[PDB]
């Protein structure tokens, strides 16, 4: 897998 | 999607 | 869930 809904949900949670 | 697994995770590491 | 993917990303991504 691409880590595609890890990476908007670290931007939108900022953490 | 609504993050629930990755919040999930985020708080049992920590990280 | 185990996590197993998002633990991936974050060892990949280091945050």
Partial sequence: ???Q???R???ILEQ
Same sequence: chains 1, 2, 3.
Avoid: R, V
Wanted: proline content about 0%; aromatic content about 12%.
């Fill in 9 to 11: 949900c670290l931007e």
């Fill in 5 to 7: 809904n890890y990476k």
């Fill in 1 to 3: 897998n691409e880590c």
